[PDB]
């Protein structure tokens, strides 16, 4: 509403002033935390763009380098798509604190259970070896970029929540407290003007009696 | 007249008296007794009492000073932990909070309707405060010196190691000055001090 | 450990990522891939992506960019974080900064 | 003076009278008439009229208590929506808000300078309230019995399904008590109920 | 009290007076002198000085309106540059945010502890404002004509094609009104105008 339900008195005035000061210090705390998260967001965006560009050029490298190692082992398409026992890249979740928020990122626990060991010892050697080296490094780099994107998303939503809280404390709460402070000042000023009138009446009656008697 | 600090009687009185023991309504609502504010109360005799303490209890004034500093730092941190929520806090802030809670719950808080906490002699008071402040100093030093070394010490691997030293402190207020005595209680407190010293020497 | 990477590309990309070392079969003999060519339709694409998401062990879904070009509706509706989803370029069409769902939230900051 | 209900005459009278119809300027500026507050007003004759309503209308006190509860829950929802937005809300809260808005805009509001709303008999009042609480009950039951299921009939489904029914629920107030009569009004209100019930069978 | 225009005296005097030069302390701490705020100040005598200006300084009122527009636009473009990252800047806005700063630093700022800036006659004032707003106009048109022409001009080319024109603009406020006459300063400003026009045609 336009005011807080309280009764005008010189005790309600200090209570309301305490409330106002507390609210407008909390506002500054939240306004600092939001800009911390915002700086982190603007950094994550830039380095995500750079990692995107570099992994894209790496992907084009791998695209033009696939054919030469393909030319040395026949056609292992059925071999690769039907024979898959156990992938040896794994991923786990870890946290990273930023101003109280817990961004989730990824840890790359490197497992080893290599099934692709036959791989034509005499039909495809260094070619396929460097090929899987390339693509494993690419897998790890894109793991890094995925962790960056996960951070990005959680940070982006927490920024919105904190800005909503700041705007609420700034547009809804503090104006209401200030309104119910101005009202209390007015009402105390109004209580004083009645005691003044009563005392002036008493004095007037005194100075009427003493003179007519 | 409702709780106003500017009642004409209360404002006329505060200009004359030298000691003011204040009333905390929030403490009387949570049933913490005696409900002394300890942040608006004052005494103007703490400089005329100096040569009495410097002759009878020569180690009390530093304990009083440090206790008051701890109780103010806790109030500074409280309205921060309220908004953000104690996630990102230095370990020294954790120790400040968890020693201030001890001081509040076990030293300042007293029960007059019990046969041991009805009248607490001053040797009991000084002993309790001395042991609590000694623990504070030891914990803070431990966490402060091994700050960037290996095996970073924290408040959590202190509450693990010494969990029963943190219980003889939270139960110093149950000794009785008429079933026990002066030398008995003093011996107990000295033994507890040696215990916590040994624990802080072993852990660190 | 608790989560595995997962692919949706083509035969050449899934074999590239098996060479990298990813590609796995469910205990129900379900793969971490669904190869797409001139054969299958987009309803299969979208319910495959749906069962990719709802599967509670997948963390990093790679999808070639030219695959996601018509199922942008399936992945734009994705708004959570941990089911990470990266669109990948290749020689047919390289990386395009326009049709990204993670540069979606960078409006203005460019 | 000033719209302040804390002036001497209002304070003197409110301790004398048994009914209190308190008007609001916020509702008067939007031309929401009559501008009764419905949150500060009261009547101390609500228990003395139980016999009359039981003997004559007999289906009204339930409707009254239900409507009062809806209007009271909406104000708890609104002060939260004002600070954290309309997104943290369950489906039953999204139903409470819309039903309370329907009540406020098409039951409590009554433009008295029109040929249809200059006077509203009590049978028309109970009929409108019946048809407005039946929808609340049906919608809440539908959103609640298919909650854990995957079909999840929510408020937006109910709203795009029945956009032909909500308009009739809002236009229930345009029925002349004189040009239409009692029988035509009662029949139309009994037909809108069947329309509501069939439309709510349609989505399950 | 504390810069609060609600005291009865301040409210009355602002209700009465027609001009209000708002001196600010914030601008004084930045060494911006004369520290007039230019955003809360006003003057309601601008329609009485219309025969005077139109008879003596005919080409002034348009420059006044233009300068006020520019100084307001540089200010309500504040969150656009903070909540966004200075990059989503239409070339019109780059031109603004630069020429408005040119005005703030070389027209609105005056230094009395000099031999040339104690007194600024009005012919010098209208000359210094006409050259600046003429620059603004030409540099803005040069951009918004080649909007889609494959020869996109931005402030980066404008600031390199005219690197001495901008200095001479920022050096207009050193022409002494006593050591240099009035015709001399008029001819200097006209020469600067024609050089601006040339160096803007040698860019298209
Ligand atoms: N129930 C209503 N229906 C239509 N108009 C109304 C209604 N109540 C008030 N008004 C309008 O609002 C104005 C309120 O005036 P009035 O009833 O005299 O209030 P007051 O006596 O408090 O001044 C009237 O002029 C009327 O036009």
Closest Cα partner for D87 from B82, A104, A156, A160? A160
CA angle D9, D11, D16 (to 5 degrees): 95
Q: Which residues contact D61 (CB under 8 A, 6 or more apart)?
A: D50, D53, D54
* HSE-CB for C92 with a 13 A CA cutoff: 10
Q: What are phi and psi of C100, to 5 degrees?
A: -120, 140
Q: With residue E124 as reference, give the H or E element that holds it.
A: helix E122-145
Cα–Cα distance measured from residue B177 to residue B116, given in angstroms and rounded to the nearest whole number: 7
Neighbours of E193 (CB within 10 A): 16
Using DSSP's 3-state secondary structure scheme, residue A93 falls into strand
> Is D82 in Cβ contact with A164 (below 8 Å)?
no
Cα–Cα distance measured from residue C106 to residue D6, given in angstroms and rounded to the nearest whole number: 54
Q: Tokens at residue D27, please?
A: 């509702």
Q: Do B95 and B136 contact (CB within 8 A), yes or no?
A: yes
Q: Do E178 and E144 contact (CB within 8 A), yes or no?
A: no
β-partners of residue A103 are A96
Cα–Cα distance measured from residue E22 to residue E36, given in angstroms and rounded to the nearest whole number: 5
Q: Does residue D151 line the site of ligand 1, with CB under 6 A?
A: no
- Residue A164 covered by a domain: yes
Q: Which residues contact D192 (CB under 8 A, 6 or more apart)?
A: D131, D165, D168, D169, D172
> Is A14 in Cβ contact with B84 (below 8 Å)?
no
With contacts defined as CB-CB under 8 Å, which chain A residues touch B5?
14
Cα–Cα distance measured from residue A155 to residue A164, given in angstroms and rounded to the nearest whole number: 14
Q: What is the DSSP letter of D108?
A: I
Question: Alpha carbon B151 to chain centroid distance?
Answer: 29
Closest-CA distance of chain C to residue A80, Å: 6
Q: Are strands D42-43 and D19-20 parallel, antiparallel or unpaired?
A: antiparallel
* HSE-CB for B49 with a 13 A CA cutoff: 9
> Is A164 in Cβ contact with D84 (below 8 Å)?
yes
Cα–Cα distance measured from residue D10 to residue D4, given in angstroms and rounded to the nearest whole number: 9
Question: Strands, E, within chain D: which ranges?
Answer: 19-20, 42-43
Cα–Cα distance measured from residue B162 to residue C44, given in angstroms and rounded to the nearest whole number: 62
β-partners of residue A91 are C3
Q: Do C11 and C35 contact (CB within 8 A), yes or no?
A: yes
Cα Dmax for chain E: 62
Using DSSP's 3-state secondary structure scheme, residue D20 falls into strand
Cα–Cα distance measured from residue E83 to residue E98, given in angstroms and rounded to the nearest whole number: 19
Provide the experimental method for this PDB entry: cryo-EM
Distances (CA, A) of B70 to B36, B73, B99, C92, D45: 17, 5, 8, 68, 60
Termini Cα distance of chain C: 36
With contacts defined as CB-CB under 8 Å, which chain C residues touch A131?
16, 19
Residue in the block written with tokens 């007003």:
D41
Q: With residue B68 as reference, give the H or E element that holds it.
A: helix B60-81
Closest Cα partner for B3 from B17, B19, B20, B23? B23
Q: Do E75 and E91 contact (CB within 8 A), yes or no?
A: no
Whether A89 contacts chain C with CB within 8 A? yes
Probe residue for ligand 1, chosen from D10, D33, D109, D117 as the CB with the greatest number of ligand atoms within 8 Å: D33
Provide the Cα torsion E80, E82, E87, E89; round to 10°: 30
Distances (CA, A) of B160 to A32, B163, B165: 35, 6, 11
State which residues form the domain around B154. Answer: 44-204
Cα–Cα distance measured from residue C67 to residue C88, given in angstroms and rounded to the nearest whole number: 9
Probe residue for ligand 1, chosen from D31, D113, D116, D119 as the CB with the greatest number of ligand atoms within 8 Å: D113
At least 3 CB pairs under 8 A between chains C and A: yes
Q: What is the 3-state secondary structure (H, E, C) of A124-180?
A: CCHHHHHHHHHHHHHHHHHHHHHHHHHHHHHHHHHHHHHHHHHHHHHHHHHHHHHHH
> Is A92 in Cβ contact with C1 (below 8 Å)?
yes
- Residue A73 covered by a domain: yes
Cα–Cα distance measured from residue A64 to residue C90, given in angstroms and rounded to the nearest whole number: 10
Cα–Cα distance measured from residue E4 to residue E204, given in angstroms and rounded to the nearest whole number: 52
Cα–Cα distance measured from residue E39 to residue E61, given in angstroms and rounded to the nearest whole number: 18
Cα–Cα distance measured from residue A129 to residue A126, given in angstroms and rounded to the nearest whole number: 5
> Is A9 in Cβ contact with B4 (below 8 Å)?
yes
CA angle B189, B194, B199 (to 5 degrees): 125
Q: Do A87 and A127 contact (CB within 8 A), yes or no?
A: no
Q: Are strands B42-43 and B19-20 parallel, antiparallel or unpaired?
A: antiparallel
CA angle D77, D80, D85 (to 5 degrees): 105
With contacts defined as CB-CB under 8 Å, which chain E residues touch C109?
84-85, 87
Strand order in the sheet with C58-64: C4-8, C58-64, C84-88
Closest Cα partner for C33 from C58, C65, C2, C66? C58
Q: Are strands C58-64 and D19-20 parallel, antiparallel or unpaired?
A: unpaired
Cα–Cα distance measured from residue B161 to residue B201, given in angstroms and rounded to the nearest whole number: 11
Q: Classify residue A69 as left (phi > 0), alpha (psi -120 to 50) or beta.
A: alpha
Cα–Cα distance measured from residue D87 to residue D79, given in angstroms and rounded to the nearest whole number: 14
Neighbours of C52 (CB within 10 A): 20
Whether C110 contacts chain E with CB within 8 A? yes
Q: Which residue of C has its CA nearest to A67?
A: C12
Q: Does residue D22 line the site of ligand 1, with CB under 6 A?
A: no
- Residue A2 covered by a domain: no
Q: Tokens at residue D128, please?
A: 């409108």
Using DSSP's 3-state secondary structure scheme, residue B118 falls into coil
Sign of CA dihedral A71, A72, A77, A80: negative
Which CATH number covers residue A103?
Answer: 1.10.287.3240
Q: Do E100 and E74 contact (CB within 8 A), yes or no?
A: yes
Q: Do B80 and B93 contact (CB within 8 A), yes or no?
A: no
> Is C108 in Cβ contact with E84 (below 8 Å)?
yes
Q: Which residue of D has its CA nearest to A183?
A: D4
Q: Do E42 and E17 contact (CB within 8 A), yes or no?
A: no
Residue in the block written with tokens 């299958």:
C40
* HSE-CB for A41 with a 13 A CA cutoff: 26
Closest Cα partner for D139 from D203, D86, D88? D203
Q: Are strands C58-64 and C4-8 parallel, antiparallel or unpaired?
A: parallel
Q: Are strands C84-88 and C58-64 parallel, antiparallel or unpaired?
A: parallel
Q: Are strands E42-43 and A92-98 parallel, antiparallel or unpaired?
A: unpaired
Residue in the block written with tokens 């199922």:
C71
Burial tier of C62 (Cβ tally within 10 Å: 0-12, 13-18, 19+): buried
Neighbours of B135 (CB within 10 A): 24
Distances (CA, A) of B65 to B34, B57, B59: 21, 14, 11
Whether A39 contacts chain C with CB within 8 A? no
Distances (CA, A) of D56 to B59, D50, D53: 86, 10, 5
Cα–Cα distance measured from residue D72 to residue D77, given in angstroms and rounded to the nearest whole number: 9
Q: With residue B131 as reference, give the H or E element that holds it.
A: helix B122-145
Whether A172 contacts chain D with CB within 8 A? yes
- Please note each residue after which chain A is broken, C-to-N distance over 2.5 A, or write none: none
Closest Cα partner for E166 from E102, E70, E100? E102
Domains held by chain A: number:
1
Cα–Cα distance measured from residue B72 to residue C10, given in angstroms and rounded to the nearest whole number: 66
Closest Cα partner for A3 from A172, A155, A177? A177
Cα–Cα distance measured from residue A177 to residue A16, given in angstroms and rounded to the nearest whole number: 7
Taking any CB pair shorter than 8 Å as contact, residues of chain B touching chain A are 2-6, 79-80, 83-85, 87-88
Burial tier of B52 (Cβ tally within 10 Å: 0-12, 13-18, 19+): exposed
Residue in the block written with tokens 């002033």:
A17
Neighbours of B85 (CB within 10 A): 10
| CB nearest C84 (choices: A109, A132, A146) | A146
- For the stretch D80-108, what's the b/e string if a residue is b when 16 or more beta carbons lie within 10 angstroms of its beta carbon? ebeeeeeeebebebbbbbbbbebbbebbb
Using DSSP's 3-state secondary structure scheme, residue D125 falls into helix
Q: Which residues contact A131 (CB under 8 A, 6 or more apart)?
A: A65, A66, A69, C16, C19
For chains A and C, CB pairs below 8 A equal: 131
Q: What is the DSSP string of A44-82?
A: HHHHHHHHHHHHHHHHHHHHHHHHHHHTTS---HHHHHH
């Amino acid at each position: 509403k336009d005011r807080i339900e309280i009764f005008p008195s010189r005790m309600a005035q200090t209570i309301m002033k305490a409330r106002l000061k507390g609210a407008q210090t909390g506002r500054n705390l939240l306004k600092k935390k939001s800009d911390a998260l915002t700086l982190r967001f603007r950094q994550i965006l830039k380095k995500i763009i750079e990692t995107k560009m570099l992994m894209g050029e790496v992907m084009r490298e791998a695209a033009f380098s696939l054919a030469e190692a393909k030319f040395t082992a026949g056609d292992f398409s059925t071999t690769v798509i039907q024979n898959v026992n156990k992938a040896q890249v794994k991923i786990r979740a870890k946290k990273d604190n930023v101003a109280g928020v817990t961004l989730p990122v990824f840890e790359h626990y490197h497992e080893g259970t290599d099934s692709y060991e036959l791989t034509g010892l005499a039909r495809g050697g260094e070619q396929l070896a460097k090929l899987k080296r390339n693509y494993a490094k690419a897998v790890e780099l894109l793991v890094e970029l995925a962790s960056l994107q996960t951070s990005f998303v959680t940070l982006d939503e927490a920024i919105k929540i904190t800005n909503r809280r700041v705007n609420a404390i700034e547009h809804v709460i503090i104006p209401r407290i200030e309104r119910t402070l101005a009202y209390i000042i007015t009402e105390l000023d109004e209580r004083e003007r009645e005691e003044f009138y009563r005392l002036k009446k008493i004095q007037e009656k005194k100075k009427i009696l003493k003179e007519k008697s | 007249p409702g709780g106003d600090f500017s009642d004409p009687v209360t404002s006329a009185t505060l200009g004359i008296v030298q000691v003011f023991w204040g009333l905390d309504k929030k403490l009387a609502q949570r049933k913490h007794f005696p409900s002394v504010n300890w942040l608006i109360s004052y005494s103007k005799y703490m400089r005329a009492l100096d040569e009495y303490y410097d002759k009878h209890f020569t180690e009390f004034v530093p304990l009083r000073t440090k206790a008051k500093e701890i109780l103010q730092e806790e109030e500074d941190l409280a309205e921060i932990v309220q908004l953000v929520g104690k996630a990102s806090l230095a370990e020294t802030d954790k120790i400040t909070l968890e020693v201030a809670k001890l001081i509040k719950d076990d030293f300042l808080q007293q029960n007059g309707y019990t046969p041991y906490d009805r009248f607490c002699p001053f040797y009991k008071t000084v002993g309790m405060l001395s042991n609590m402040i000694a623990f504070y100093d030891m914990a803070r030093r431990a966490v402060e010196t091994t700050a960037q070394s290996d095996n970073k010490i924290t408040w959590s691997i202190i509450r693990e190691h010494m969990g029963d030293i943190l219980y003889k402190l939270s139960s110093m207020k149950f000794k009785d000055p008429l079933k026990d005595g002066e030398a008995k209680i003093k011996s107990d407190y000295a033994q507890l001090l040696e215990d916590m010293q040994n624990a802080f020497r072993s852990l660190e | 450990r608790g989560k595995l990477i997962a692919v949706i590309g083509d035969e050449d990309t899934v074999t590239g990522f098996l060479l990298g070392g990813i590609g796995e079969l469910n205990k129900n003999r379900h793969p971490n891939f669904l190869v797409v060519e001139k054969d299958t339709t987009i309803n299969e694409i979208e319910d495959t992506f749906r069962q990719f998401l709802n599967r509670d062990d997948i963390g990093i879904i790679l999808i070639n960019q030219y695959i996601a070009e018509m199922v942008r509706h399936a992945l734009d509706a994705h708004q959570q974080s941990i089911p990470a989803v990266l669109e990948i370029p290749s020689k047919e069409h390289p990386y395009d900064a326009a049709k990204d769902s993670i540069l979606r939230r960078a409006r203005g900051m460019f």
